[PDB]
Design an enzyme around this catalytic site. Structure first.
Site, PDB file in Angstrom:
ATOM      1  N   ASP A   1       0.837  -1.471   0.204  1.00 54.29           N
ATOM      2  CA  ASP A   1       0.425   0.056   0.162  1.00 54.29           C
ATOM      3  C   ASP A   1       0.898   0.785  -0.072  1.00 54.29           C
ATOM      4  O   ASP A   1       1.911   1.324  -1.206  1.00 54.29           O
ATOM      5  CB  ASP A   1      -1.402  -0.466   1.088  1.00 54.29           C
ATOM      6  CG  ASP A   1      -2.480   1.059   1.044  1.00 54.29           C
ATOM      7  OD1 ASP A   1      -3.216   0.238   0.476  1.00 54.29           O
ATOM      8  OD2 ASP A   1      -1.403   1.898   1.651  1.00 54.29           O
TER       9      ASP A   1
ATOM     10  N   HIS B   1      -6.985  -7.193  -0.588  1.00 53.74           N
ATOM     11  CA  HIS B   1      -5.891  -5.998  -0.648  1.00 53.74           C
ATOM     12  C   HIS B   1      -4.701  -6.107   0.368  1.00 53.74           C
ATOM     13  O   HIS B   1      -3.897  -5.724   0.541  1.00 53.74           O
ATOM     14  CB  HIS B   1      -6.126  -4.666   0.396  1.00 53.74           C
ATOM     15  CG  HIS B   1      -4.963  -3.327   0.022  1.00 53.74           C
ATOM     16  ND1 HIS B   1      -4.522  -3.201  -1.531  1.00 53.74           N
ATOM     17  CD2 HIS B   1      -4.947  -2.480   1.143  1.00 53.74           C
ATOM     18  CE1 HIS B   1      -3.642  -2.074  -0.433  1.00 53.74           C
ATOM     19  NE2 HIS B   1      -4.354  -2.026   0.460  1.00 53.74           N
TER      20      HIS B   1
END
Lengths: 297, 297
Positions: free
Chosen positions: B108, B278
């Site tokens: 991320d 994610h």
């Protein structure tokens, strides 16, 4: 809350989807005025008196906004789709005997308006849309610059309760932030403080806030889908239409507005107004003069 | 009341010229820097770091401004939160440990630091792994309705202060849990260690930390994009061997796979989907750990 329409009556119009509140004044041909977000019908308070000189002016709160009833939404946000809102406002106008009327909408109300004109063009004599492009166009032009400018299109479209929960901590801040940031000045100075209090009070109601999010969810999904079908099918509004936009309003950021609208409508005239997004409040004389001229031809 | 999720890891406060970086350090062997992203902290590595620490000196760092790292004063360009500046600060941090050439895996926002570090200073990296990102430029360049709704926070958190900060103040516990939940395959928090969630929650509870995160995203919309564009335009590629891992669910897997995109940015990249949303190191720890070990060994 102030009465910002001295001399206007007040009507609670029943529709199958709930009551539409409206201020009603003037006489002559019927002209429905629709506000947008995060406003109520009172945003017309500086131009409606001038329109009332020549038209029977109906200044309606959108379904779910202001003092209009809030139809319970659903997974498709159906009552807050512009298609549904337009059908509901058509019903309201019918309740008053208005099956053919002129329409001016601002922001969300303008989206109701051009959807009404696409779905039900026979209902409209003339249509004016203020500081918008069709929803489809905003989405199809949603690049980095535009995503940043109208981030709220995607933020408020997030699944409930995410925007609701974030809005609820300090609703006053957000409504005022939106009113200010879309004006030319970037502050509250263009707004009558009494009008601001109407907007803040409406925004203070969690259910009202949820409705606005529903509107934006519809904006992201069904409204887009509806527009997409028409743009893909080459359906243009046949109603003579006026597109007004603020020189520093939202519409002009995405594109040149008349060019866009000429793709959506067969009879469009357009004019910019030196104003931010809130044309009837930032530029009441100019807006009213444009509306009067357009609806009087 | 904040669990130690890295038994046997030391806790280092690494001084840099922009403030301290906090890191858990364990293992022995070549140095490997693990960088988390939003809205997490280094503890997100808690399931994979011990497996890595079997073969590497694993430095699990809080990003500048995140977790227990100091928060450099930002500026009108959000300079300290640009990935260029964060890379530079982490390079300085690694130099404090005597690591001038190290392996790097970032998830991320940390992966954005990582590939920017790789672009600016590729001789610092033996190998790079990026987890569940595409370059910031690719996000913005592919910006459209679908991605605007999906990664709405890219434009929401990039709004000028104090708009995101105020809204995030509305319900910070909800927001961080909603982000953690909504970006997993499950859709809830069940993939996370509750004690890790408590870390994320407490960091997110600090307004100053939240402001840093917005500063990160503001950088992500402005300077980081400009820095990436320069490399795209100059055709600068990452010359470091790199592994791109992404969740089959989550933030990338669309038309072209992340690998196809990354191959435009990196001369030597292999890639694999992980059955994950994610949060690969937490949703899919064994698979993530396995891929990283295999890659970095």
């Amino acid at each position: 809350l102030a009465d910002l329409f001295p001399g206007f009556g007040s009507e609670w119009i029943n529709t199958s989807s709930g009551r539409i509140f409206a201020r009603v004044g003037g006489d002559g041909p019927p002209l429905l005025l629709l506000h947008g977000f995060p406003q109520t019908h009172v945003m017309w308070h500086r131009v409606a008196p001038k329109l009332a000189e020549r038209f029977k002016v109906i200044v309606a709160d959108l379904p779910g906004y202001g003092w209009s009833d809030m139809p319970e939404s659903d997974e498709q946000h159906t009552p807050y789709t512009k298609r549904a809102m337009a059908k509901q406002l058509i019903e309201a106008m019918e309740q008053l005997g208005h099956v053919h009327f002129a329409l001016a909408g601002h922001d969300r109300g303008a989206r109701v308006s051009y959807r009404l004109a696409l779905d039900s063009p026979g209902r409209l004599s003339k249509l004016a849309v203020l500081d918008i492009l069709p929803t489809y166009e905003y989405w199809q032009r949603m690049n980095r610059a535009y995503a940043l400018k109208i981030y709220h299109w995607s933020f408020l479209a997030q699944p409930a309760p995410l925007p609701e929960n974030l809005l609820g901590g300090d609703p006053d801040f957000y409504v005022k932030a939106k009113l200010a940031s879309w004006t030319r000045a970037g502050d509250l100075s263009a707004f009558d403080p009494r009008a601001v209090e109407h907007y803040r009070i409406a925004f203070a109601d969690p259910m009202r806030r949820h409705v606005m999010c529903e509107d934006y969810r519809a904006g992201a999904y069904a409204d887009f889908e509806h527009d997409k079908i028409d743009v893909e099918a080459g359906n243009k509004i046949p109603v003579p239409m006026l597109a007004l936009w603020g020189a520093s309003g939202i519409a002009q950021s995405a594109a040149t507005p008349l060019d866009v609208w000429r793709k959506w409508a067969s009879d469009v005239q357009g004019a910019p107004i030196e104003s931010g997004h809130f044309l009837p409040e930032e530029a009441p004389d100019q807006t009213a003069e444009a509306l009067v001229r357009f609806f009087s031809a």
